[PDB]
Amino acid sequence: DKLIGSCVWGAVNYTSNCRAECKRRGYKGGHCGSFANVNCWCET
């Protein structure tokens, strides 16, 4: 899994869509999780 940012509103790396953004950047996909869906990890 590749961390590219955070799927939480407020962080200086908020992903518009965790799965979509990661897919665009040549990734299998992406899932939002960690502590209360804060970190966005791209499927890899």
Q: Which domains does the chain have, with CATH numbers?
A: 1-44 (3.30.30.10)
Method of determination used here: NMR
| Rounded-to-integer distance, Cα 17 and Cα 20, Å | 5
- Contacts of 2-7 with CB under 8 Å at 24 or more apart are 2/27, 2/41, 2/42, 2/44, 3/39, 3/40, 3/41, 3/42, 4/30, 4/40, 4/42, 5/40, 6/38, 6/39, 6/40, 7/32, 7/37, 7/38, 7/39, 7/40
